[PDB]
Ligand binder design. Structure first.
Ligand SMILES: *[C@@H]1O[C@H](CO)[C@@H](O)[C@H](O)[C@H]1NC(C)=O
Ligand SMILES: *[C@@H]1O[C@H](CO)[C@@H](O)[C@H](O)[C@H]1NC(C)=O
Lengths: 312, 97, 97, 52, 49
């Protein structure tokens, strides 16, 4: 098994949301998210790829390029034009493989957008995003002073030691422009400089291999006939939006960058309380500027445990 | 926490299929017919009845599980270990038993 | 049980064998666009997390201090213990002395 | 998007001229559960909207 | 009384003399960065408001 980048290529997907608020096809399709890191950062998938050069271009890696496919083939562009937002701008943290790591504010949905210099292409997905903090009071921003405690977060290092993903070749790609009924019979084009395979169900299973040649078949109706712009040269990550090739064979894998690791994080030491003196008891004076957890338990048989949240 | 799997579907252009079996956890399959799937290059295949689509689904532990995992434990037979400091005639001894 | 704690099991964190049941029934394909509409119940892990209850650390009697890697308690006091003690006669001192 | 007031602005190349008015704007959806964004799959039902 | 109305007093709005008591206990310096971590109870003025 390998971790290279040349053997992989991006692919097209179906986003429920597009720049026109109509579910449609985009090459920036995403499938899921992960936000278990205590820092609030997020790891995001995508059909496309960046942090490398165009998948298939001589350069395996160029951090200024984003790999995507459109029209008939893969293309290049500067990754700088990319942006992320859920309720506002998101600061980039790192990128590798198909995957991106970045921090966003609280929100109810996430979106990734990019301008091709002439149009805005974006994809939105739904996700519950809150500000989960470690400790006993949900603070707002970490203080300079406090106690240092164990925590788990995603490391900004491009290298990783977690996860696993499948990779294999795709199914055929059917292009409508390859099929024409302009002629009384079936007219198709590979087109020039290709090796197309085409199929037709009229009568029986009819197949035809044509390279740089327009060809005809008996059944004049060009609709039932089917053609492929097939290349079968690149491995892709399994996605629901893509048909399974008849091979259905696991051919390779890849890692997931930016794994989760333990580390040390600071937390506030809230205003400690003033203690009174009470007959067979005690009365307290708690002070806080934020919700904070408190509790106590007896030290004998009956635990008599109690807990509470205090705001002010 | 678990992550589902939605593998690339098994689509037979103008033919037939079935619902096989597998050992994957929560593995399921289901089939339909008379389907016209489409795609950016156009419609890949259409056959009013002969087209068939087969989908399958399973699940696996999420990659982050490696650290977010919880475990179920069966416990029994509580046993005690005690550390003692014993001084006799300015003769100290630290013991554990 | 779908929607219940421990919906997914594994003898090891990375064991290939896995078993679960969370009410995954597939859905018929939608209009004209190839995809896999699916359905399944939320993970019991997150549900139990939202309502797991408070840790035993804040409920054990006698002020137990509990740690995980030995799954043990410490400095938790209750009851009485008999003890038998043997002593060298050298440590003893003659009364006249 | 949802909001409590609307505004229209324009730059004349040297200054910003804009007008704001007050209005209650929410995300009203048809059916029986107020969704968030329409799904790919579902049931098709009658609705009323402004034609572009 | 800390956290209570009238925690700060003055015979005049600009009188130099002033007296208060609001439970200000200083905190030990933090890690490697010079600063003054402090602590004190909210103003009774805003609470009473
Ligand atoms: C198509 O592929 C065949 C087999 O590799 C080859 O002989 C033929 O020259 C190719 N035609 C092209 C690339 O136009
Ligand atoms: C313990 O006490 C005895 C007398 O009672 C004395 O001789 C001896 O030196 C003492 N030992 C120590 C370690 O102080």
């Amino acid at each position: 098994i390998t971790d290279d980048f040349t053997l992989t290529s991006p692919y097209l997907g179906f986003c429920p949301y597009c720049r026109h608020s109509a579910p449609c096809f985009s090459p920036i399709k995403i499938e899921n998210v992960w936000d278990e890191s205590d820092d609030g950062s997020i790891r995001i998938q995508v059909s496309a790829q960046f942090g490398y050069n165009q998948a298939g271009t001589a350069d395996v890696t160029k951090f200024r390029y984003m790999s995507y496919d459109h029209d008939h083939d893969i293309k290049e562009d500067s990754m700088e034009k990319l942006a992320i937002s859920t309720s506002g701008p998101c600061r980039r943290l790192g990128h590798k493989g198909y995957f991106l790591l970045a921090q966003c504010p609280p929100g109810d949905s996430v979106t990734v957008s990019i301008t091709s210099g002439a149009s805005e292409n974006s994809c939105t997905v739904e996700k519950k995003i809150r500000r989960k903090f470690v400790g006993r009071e949900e603070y707002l921003f970490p203080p300079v002073h406090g106690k240092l405690v164990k925590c788990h977060v995603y490391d900004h290092l491009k290298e990783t030691s977690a996860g696993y993903i499948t990779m294999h070749r795709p199914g055929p790609h059917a292009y409508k422009s390859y099929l024409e009924e302009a002629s009384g019979e079936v007219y198709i084009k590979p087109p020039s400089g290709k090796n197309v395979t085409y199929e037709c169900k009229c009568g029986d299973y009819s197949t035809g291999i044509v390279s740089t040649r327009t060809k005809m078949n008996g059944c004049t109706k060009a609709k039932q006939c089917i053609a492929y712009k097939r290349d079968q040269t690149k491995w892709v990550f399994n996605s629901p939006d893509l048909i399974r090739h008849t091979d259905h064979s696991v051919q390779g894998k890849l890692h997931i960058p930016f794994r989760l690791t333990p580390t040390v994080c600071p937390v506030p030491l809230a205003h400690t309380p003033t203690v009174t003196k009470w007959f067979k008891g005690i009365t307290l004076h708690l002070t806080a500027t934020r919700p904070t957890l408190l509790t106590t338990r007896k030290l004998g048989l009956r635990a008599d445990a109690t807990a509470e949240w205090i705001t002010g | 926490k678990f992550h589902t799997v939605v593998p690339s579907p098994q689509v037979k252009c103008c033919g037939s299929l079935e619902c096989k079996a597998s050992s994957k956890a929560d593995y399921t399959c289901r089939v339909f017919g008379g389907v016209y799937p489409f795609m950016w290059g156009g419609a890949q295949c259409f056959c009013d009845s002969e087209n068939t689509q087969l989908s399958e689904a399973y699940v696996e532990f999420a990659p982050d599980c490696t650290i977010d995992h919880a475990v179920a434990l069966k416990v029994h037979t509580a046993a005690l270990k005690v550390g003692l400091r014993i001084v006799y005639g300015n003769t100290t001894a630290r013991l554990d038993t | 049980n779908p929607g219940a704690f421990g919906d997914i099991q594994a003898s090891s964190l990375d064991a290939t064998d896995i078993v679960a049941r969370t009410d995954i029934r597939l859905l018929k394909p939608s209009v004209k666009n190839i995809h896999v509409p699916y359905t399944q119940a939320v993970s019991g892990y997150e549900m139990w997390k939202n309502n797991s209850g408070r840790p035993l650390q804040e409920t054990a009697p006698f002020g137990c201090k509990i740690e995980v890697e030995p799954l043990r308690a410490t400095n938790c006091a209750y009851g009485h213990i008999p003890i038998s003690i043997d002593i060298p006669d050298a440590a003893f001192v003659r009364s006249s002395e």
